[PDB]
From a paper:
To improve crystallization, a number of variants were produced to reduce the surface entropy or to truncate predicted surface loops. One variant, containing a deletion of residues 99–107, resulted in large, easily reproducible crystals in the cubic space group F23 [Supplementary Fig. S5(b)] from new crystallization conditions.
IdmH is a homodimer, with the individual protomers consisting of an α+β barrel.
Author numbering:
A (entry chain B): 6 to 134
B (entry chain A): 7 to 134
Write the structure that this text describes.
Amino acid sequence: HQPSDTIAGLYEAFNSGDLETLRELIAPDAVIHLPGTAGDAEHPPGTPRDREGWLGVWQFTQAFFPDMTATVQDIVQTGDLVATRCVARGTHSGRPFEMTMLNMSRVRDGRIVEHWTISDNVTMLAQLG
Amino acid sequence: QPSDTIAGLYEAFNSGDLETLRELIAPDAVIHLPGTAGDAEHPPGTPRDREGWLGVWQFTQAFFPDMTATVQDIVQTGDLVATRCVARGTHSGRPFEMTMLNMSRVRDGRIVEHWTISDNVTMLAQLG
């Protein structure tokens, strides 16, 4: 049950802003598949990022939603693959939101080497405006 | 096994097999669809039942008639199965590949709870 612990540790580390732990738990050359909403001028929607590309997108999103946190609701493991359902909770200008996130991660030697994630952005927008 | 149920579900969606879909999904299943599947009558974040889900899926089938969903990775622990799928098709001569992530609870060989989200923005970018 080591891969499960890695992924639980990842979301803890994102919530705390713990860069050191993030960089231990994610390989520098990990293949990170972010959703099309994270697409931009240099990286069109289908294009994988590396670790620091992912942490860059995370930091941008944190600037807009400084109190956003992720809590793991379900976790399943088979071999080196871990899938998770999380709920991202925050407020925008004092109005609370709850958004589902689904993730799939490959873990090797206690580090993330591949990750897919998608968030329910439309449901979150509906709750705010 | 729960893995077999979920593999059978995506086969049945690909073939348009309503009878098998209704065998594999309980009528009272709790289906958490993304906000994109929200509607005037069903606001975003409201769960649907089976027939609500099959209603949304039938619209999506009619809109992308050559789209298929293929299970790429599947993980199982107890009654929970998560899957990563790729939805592939050519729509009006433009090819597309979009990731889908799903999580299902299976009980007595039927889906009783399901969460799904698709990478719609990536798909739209590939078509326009």
